[PDB]
């Protein structure tokens, strides 16, 4: 029941405090005369073990410890959008403004959001004094910026009746916006909601994936598509084109919120993203608006302590889940969760928890699942019957670039879609360097129905694309010894067709206008054309071999060099400088040219 | 029986990790179930891990978080875990802990049993005597499953083994209809399915598919999403096996239990061991994993004097496609037979990608025979395997020898290869083939050659079946 403790001991970041028995697991405390935030992680009798969040140098035995009855939490309110945050949600920009200094003072204490800025509130205009309301009900709107109107709602697990609603006008998070009366008691509320980070917000119901996710990399979009509300993981020792992927998904998608959480990042890398991303812009309704209006960032450099690394991912996904509850579509991008697992291994090791395999505690898999499985499409609580979703793209930095490590095995065993990246293709500079053989995605079958209702053509073309690419791989595995001497005619057609698929339609140049983004229909057109010429060439050679005057690839190259050149040059049908009509008519006209040339050679 | 009031303690000598240590408990016993009530009102269950004098330790199921020292109640039950088994559980859906989740009522228990089960006397074992049909032509024709055989299914991450499992579930059954359908109407067959360590998409897919097939009146279902507490992972199998036992030997039925993702079982068991502070064994997995998997697998077979049986089809994934990984190694040692799926075949867009070349069986010789099936099974299987092996190695030969030097019989072998992979193996998710259809297709594929090449078939059956 006491309120003050003492610091009995210290050893690295792990201290031991005495004279506190009225405390429980995973509450917050303040340590020393610097007021460092710490969390309880173990208990024994009267004593306890705290993990302090900032550096510990100089803390002496006998310092006070001011407990607070509240677990780790993440504030959520207007202004959260278009800002930068640390692991514990602490605005770096506000700090640099306040101190006017270059460093992080130890134990800065500033509110996560603003407390002196007025927004324009607009109540829901459908609730009068005395109306009943449960949790999750929208009751107002606030214009965050030109592109997003931050919805306001009551927290879950709360209900009552209406007492007072402020008229529309300028208010701020300090004053009272709503007033409610529960049966027997009364309470007031403000724009700000505080939520425990290691707790899953409730939902009405969960729904199947029903619409794909748009991206610019035709690789892993026609090959291993990922779905809206979907889960996947980008392996690779570094973000090999990964930053370009997030940037493109921002530039081109139906998404509404874009939360990129950095963890264990190199200093100049986050300097890169903070310099470049804010200056990227995009036309929404013919007006060019910065992508910051629909982006949040949670930086955490490598020199940050261990517990901040642990906290960053959870706070990020709490933000994402809250925005998903707001009735939007969301996309998140983790970054270097391998170092996060390593950080967890360290903090386990200091506490004398018996390791299992390579030092990784056994319960890492459970935590790993507890993170990823938050993703998915949902119907949301509340009167409006709104709808939302959230899709997480992970990041695994495997030690040694293989599957041996427990972390990569465990994350592989629970992620729906795997996006294995070849090291050899990364050395070949045919970017993006996707393996196309060790990868998979469990979203083919659901999207079959979608692609039948809208296109009726994509599924067989795609399946044949896989078959031809794979047969090329197998014939490559065969020909290594005989030096391609035994390449027959059909083998030659297969080899050339899949080689063309590799060269023209399995690699893009992200630094050029004709390659930064390919829509679905454009991919479908190019793939249709590929399967078309394969089909006609195979039909011609078979018919002529059966009947008379066999047709070999030499006469084929001779007569239709123009067709093949046009087919390679489809890649450069710049949608940036040309409309959809021109390029689609080009694809159709090249298909007809191929038809006419094959008729001529028949 | 029990009539004493229960105790409850407000003593907490400490907490650490997923455990909670207390003391001053009167006459504690091991494996006693314990309830808990937190300051905020939440209720959580648990079990007793350690006991030493008046000291006790309890591993909280739901995960430890926010447990105060002084404000915490801890009620004791005084009994080990007991399952409320009941025949009426068919048509229901449960979670790992056994709480229903399909908006239905709590099970009106018909009898209480021990979760652990009891070893079955080897004296009262009965050898299997007859086969079953799973609905897959590739499996029934080429690799028989007897009543009481324990056949695992090795797969790997990224393959459609779950779809194969669902297909097996919605089509498993018997073939007693050889003589008459009138005597076949007496059906006494059921399936119990234990999805464990499964992600959310697959859980929903299973629930939807099982509900769609329309035969939910004889399917029990247990779900344990990967969110749920890790300890519930290693309690789901025990509930499923106890239910299967009660149905098999108290209702004289014919039950087929199908377990999923035993790798997740192994991982959960590993975590329990490491939390329990025990010394690691080989590869970080505990030493007694063999004994544990033995006590899970060994609950099946047939019992003398009881008209019933239990058949096991566990599934598991091989990390890194490594056949010498301990989990598949021990699983192979304890069980009889094995079935493979191969990456390449799935990568040829062939469904189900079932690679019969390394697939074996242990009781095929005695599962099949005159009466329970046709007289033309074993020879047909041998001939199909021999023809296919010839065809594949012969394709390997023609890869370099050139197609021009091939004989015409060589083209017949290639024709056999392509047709066998086009029709016999490929079936499609809903093409419910029976055993007799499977043998019909087998004979049709064999018809390509003359009986002279078919040197594994006896002439006596050649004079009957070959000229069809």
């Amino acid at each position: 029941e006491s309120t003050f403790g003492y610091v009995h001991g210290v050893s690295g970041p792990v201290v031991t405090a005495c004279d506190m028995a009225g405390a429980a697991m995973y509450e917050l405390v303040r340590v020393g005369h610097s007021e460092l935030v710490g969390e309880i992680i173990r208990l024994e009798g009267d004593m306890a073990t705290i993990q302090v969040y900032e550096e510990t140098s100089g803390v002496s035995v006998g310092d006070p410890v001011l407990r607070t009855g509240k677990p780790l939490s993440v504030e959520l309110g207007p202004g959260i959008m278009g800002a930068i945050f640390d692991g514990i949600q602490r605005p770096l920009s506000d700090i640099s403004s306040q101190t006017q200094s270059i460093y992080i003072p130890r134990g800065v204490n500033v509110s996560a959001l603003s407390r002196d800025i007025k927004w324009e509130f607009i109540p829901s205009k459908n609730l009068r004094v005395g109306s009943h309301i449960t949790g999750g009900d929208i009751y107002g709107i606030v214009n965050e910026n030109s592109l997003i109107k931050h919805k306001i709602m009551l927290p879950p697990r709360n209900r009552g009746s209406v007492t007072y609603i402020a008229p529309p006008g300028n208010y701020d998070a300090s004053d009272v916006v709503l007033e409610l009366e529960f049966e027997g008691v009364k309470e007031k509320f403000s724009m700000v909601q505080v939520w425990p980070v290691r707790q899953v917000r409730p939902v009405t119901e969960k729904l199947p994936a029903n619409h794909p996710l748009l991206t610019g990399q035709r690789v892993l979009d026609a090959l291993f598509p990922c779905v809206q509300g979907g889960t996947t993981a980008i392996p690779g020792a570094f973000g090999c084109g990964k930053t370009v992927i997030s940037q493109s998904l921002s530039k081109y998608s139906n998404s509404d919120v874009i939360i990129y959480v950095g963890c264990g990042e190199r200093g100049n890398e986050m300097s890169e993203v903070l310099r470049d991303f804010p200056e990227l812009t995009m036309e929404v309704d013919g007006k060019v608006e910065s992508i910051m209006k629909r982006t949040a960032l949670v930086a955490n450099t490598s020199n940050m302590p261990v517990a901040a690394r642990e906290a960053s991912i959870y706070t990020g996904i709490t933000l994402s889940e809250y925005f998903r509850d707001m009735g939007y579509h969301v996309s998140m991008m983790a970054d270097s969760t391998s170092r996060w697992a390593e950080a967890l291994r360290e903090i386990s090791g200091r506490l004398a928890e018996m390791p299992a395999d390579s030092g990784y505690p056994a319960y890492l898999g459970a935590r790993l699942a507890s993170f990823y499985e938050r993703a998915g499409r949902v119907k949301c609580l509340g009167n409006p019957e709104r709808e939302g979703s959230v899709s997480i793209v992970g990041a695994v930095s495997p030690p040694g670039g293989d599957f041996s490590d427990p972390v990569t095995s465990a994350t592989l065993g629970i992620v729906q879609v795997f996006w294995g990246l070849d090291k050899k293709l990364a050395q070949r500079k045919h970017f993006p360097s996707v393996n196309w053989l060790i990868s998979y995605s469990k979203y083919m079958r659901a999207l079959d129905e979608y692609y039948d209702k809208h296109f009726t053509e994509f599924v067989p073309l795609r399946t044949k694309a896989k078959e031809i690419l794979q047969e090329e791989e197998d014939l490559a595995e065969i020909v290594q010894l005989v030096g391609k001497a035994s390449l027959a005619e059909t083998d030659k057609i297969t080899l050339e067709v899949a080689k063309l698929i590799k060269d023209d339609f399995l690699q893009q140049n992200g630094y050029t206008p004709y390659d930064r983004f390919c829509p679905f229909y454009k991919t479908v057109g190019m793939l249709s054309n590929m399967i078309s010429f394969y089909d006609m060439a195979r039909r011609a050679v078979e018919t002529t071999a059966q009947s008379d005057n066999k047709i070999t690839w030499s006469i084929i190259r001779e007569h239709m060099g123009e067709i093949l050149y046009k087919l390679s040059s489809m890649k450069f049908k710049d949608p940036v400088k040309d409309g959809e009509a021109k390029i689609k008519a080009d694809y159709a006209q090249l298909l007809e040219d191929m038809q006419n040339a094959f008729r001529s050679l028949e | 029986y029990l009539s004493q009031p229960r105790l409850t303690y407000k003593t907490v000598s400490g907490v650490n990790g997923p455990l909670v240590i207390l003391d001053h408990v009167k006459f504690p016993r091991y494996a006693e179930i314990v309830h808990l009530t937190l300051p905020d009102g939440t209720k959580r269950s648990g079990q007793v891990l350690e006991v030493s004098g008046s000291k006790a330790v309890v591993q909280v199921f739901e995960g430890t978080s926010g447990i105060d020292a002084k404000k915490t109640s801890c009620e004791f039950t005084g009994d080990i875990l007991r399952t409320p088994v009941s025949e009426d559980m068919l048509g229901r859906v449960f979670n790992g802990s056994g709480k229903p989740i399909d908006r239905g009522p709590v099970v009106l228990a018909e009898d209480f049993l021990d979760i652990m089960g009891q070893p079955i006397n080897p004296q009262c074992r009965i050898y299997p005597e007859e086969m079953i049909q799973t609905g897959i032509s590739a499996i029934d024709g080429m690799n028989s499953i007897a009543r009481g055989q324990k056949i695992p299914i090795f797969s790997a991450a990224g393959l459609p083994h779950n779809e194969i499992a669902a297909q097996i579930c919605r089509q498993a059954g018997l073939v007693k209809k050889s003589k008459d359908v009138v005597d076949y109407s007496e059906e006494n067959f059921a399936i119990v399915f234990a999805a464990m360590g499964v992600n959310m998409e697959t859980a929903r897919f299973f629930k939807s598919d099982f509900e769609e097939n329309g035969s939910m009146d004889n399917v029990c279902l247990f779900l344990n999403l990967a969110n749920d507490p890790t300890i519930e992972r290693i309690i789901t199998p025990r509930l499923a096996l106890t239910t299967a036992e009660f149905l098999a030997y108290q209702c004289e039925k014919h039950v087929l239990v199908i377990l999923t993702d035993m790798s997740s079982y192994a991982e959960a068991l590993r975590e329990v061991s490491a939390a329990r502070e025990e010394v690691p064994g080989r590869r970080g997995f505990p030493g007694y994993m063999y004994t544990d998997l033995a006590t899970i697998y060994e609950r099946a077979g047939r019992v003398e004097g009881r008209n019933g049986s239990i058949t096991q089809i566990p599934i598991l994934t091989m990390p890194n496609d490594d056949i010498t990984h301990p989990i598949p190694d021990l699983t192979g040692y304890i069980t009889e037979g094995q079935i493979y799926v191969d990456r390449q075949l799935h990568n040829r867009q062939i469904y189900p990608p079932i690679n019969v070349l390394p697939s074996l069986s242990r009781l095929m010789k005695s599962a099949i025979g005159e009466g329970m099936t046709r007289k033309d099974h074993a020879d047909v299987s041998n001939q199909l395997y021999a023809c296919y092996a010839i065809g594949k190695d012969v394709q390997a030969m023609k890869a370099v020898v050139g197609e021009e030097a091939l004989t015409s019989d060589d083209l017949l072998y290639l024709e056999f290869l392509q047709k066998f992979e086009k029709n016999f193996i490929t079936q499609g998710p809903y093409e419910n083939r029976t055993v007799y259809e499977t043998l019909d297709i087998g004979w049709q594929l064999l018809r390509i050659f003359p009986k002279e090449m078919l040197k594994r078939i006896p002439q006596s059956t050649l004079s009957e079946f070959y000229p069809r």
């Binding site: 004398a352 018996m354 390791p355 | 010394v279 690691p280």
Partner: peptide, 13 residues
């Protein structure tokens, strides 16, 4: 394995 065992034994004291 051995070094972990020795930690375990040391912790008994």
């Amino acid at each position: 394995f051995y070094r972990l065992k020795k930690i375990q034994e040391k912790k008994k004291i």
